[PDB]
């Protein structure tokens, strides 16, 4: 964990008047944020509690102390004991949930996190980017990253906070049915979009991939199934059948591959979220 975490909101000083209620009350962080506190002048007392309020351990910290991260889920309360108290507080995540954390963006796939384990930094291609979730993540790590949607305001987004962030991505409006990739990339990925795709048109899109990933490249594609035990629930433009992305990649070596049930951010109401097949896959050209 040692450069696991990055920052993602840095407060500014906080002092004994302004500190705010908030954090004066029992309260946690949600689940993937950590909480770096820093005192920069005088003391801090910093109450450890139970979810009904109790109080477990006490700690008092000064700007010798060395603040261990707060705990993501961990129910705590702070004050000021000194009146010249002067103390900052920064949020922390794992870079998998920063952007989703700093900008509110859909969570990445877990599948994108894991084939960044094994794919090193690399030229990559987000097909079908949308608001850009995997090619911020990707760039964030040092990947070469090239994105392409239709939708205006999804690559106005995705340009709007690469400047942000410095990072340097290279964007355009493009119809995916076209299947005119012109370069070549070590990674191919499109997880976001491919239920919105022309039916007479995936073939040549498919195609058109594998023509344009180098040998020991990869191609990694989430996307809807409709099956006969598990029909679409939505009349998706576009949805693979039983074992046909697999079919697409017969040739290539697979290093995942699966039709498990999914759920869709999206929901019903209820207010579940909606379930289907997916195909998930990671395959490697050889």
Same mark, same amino acid.
């Given at each position: 964990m040692k450069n696991e975490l990055i920052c993602y909101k840095q407060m500014p000083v906080w002092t004994k008047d302004n500190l705010p209620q908030m954090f004066q009350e029992k309260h946690n962080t949600k689940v993937g944020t950590w909480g770096k506190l820093t005192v920069l002048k005088g003391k801090l007392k910093f109450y450890e509690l139970t979810? @009904?309020?109790?109080?477990i351990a006490e700690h008092i910290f000064t700007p010798e102390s060395h603040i261990p991260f707060v705990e993501p889920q961990a129910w705590h309360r702070v004050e000021a004991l000194s009146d010249d108290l002067e103390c900052t507080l920064g949020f922390y995540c794992k870079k998998e949930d920063y952007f989703s954390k700093k900008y509110n963006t859909t969570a990445i796939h877990g599948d994108v996190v894991d084939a960044a384990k094994i794919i090193s930094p690399c030229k990559v291609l987000d097909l079908g980017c949308g608001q850009g979730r995997n090619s911020l993540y990707l760039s964030l790590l040092g990947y070469d990253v090239t994105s392409w949607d239709h939708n205006e305001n999804s690559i106005a987004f995705l340009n709007e906070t690469k400047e942000k962030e410095n990072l340097n991505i290279s964007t355009a409006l493009y119809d $995916? @049915? #076209? #299947?005119? $990739?012109q370069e070549n990339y070590d990674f191919i990925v499109s997880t976001v979009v491919f239920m919105f795709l022309n039916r007479e048109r995936v073939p040549s899109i498919i195609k058109n991939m594998k023509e344009h990933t180098n040998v020991g490249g990869y191609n990694l594609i989430v996307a809807a199934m409709s099956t006969d035990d598990v029909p679409c629930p939505l009349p998706f433009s576009f949805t693979f059948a039983e074992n046909e992305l697999k079919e697409y990649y017969k040739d290539w070596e697979f290093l995942e591959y699966n039709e498990n049930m999914g759920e869709l951010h999206k929901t019903d109401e209820n207010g579940n979220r909606i379930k289907m097949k997916f195909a998930t896959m990671l395959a490697r050209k050889k």
């Open positions: 979810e @009904n309020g109790d109080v $995916i @049915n #076209a #299947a005119n $990739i």
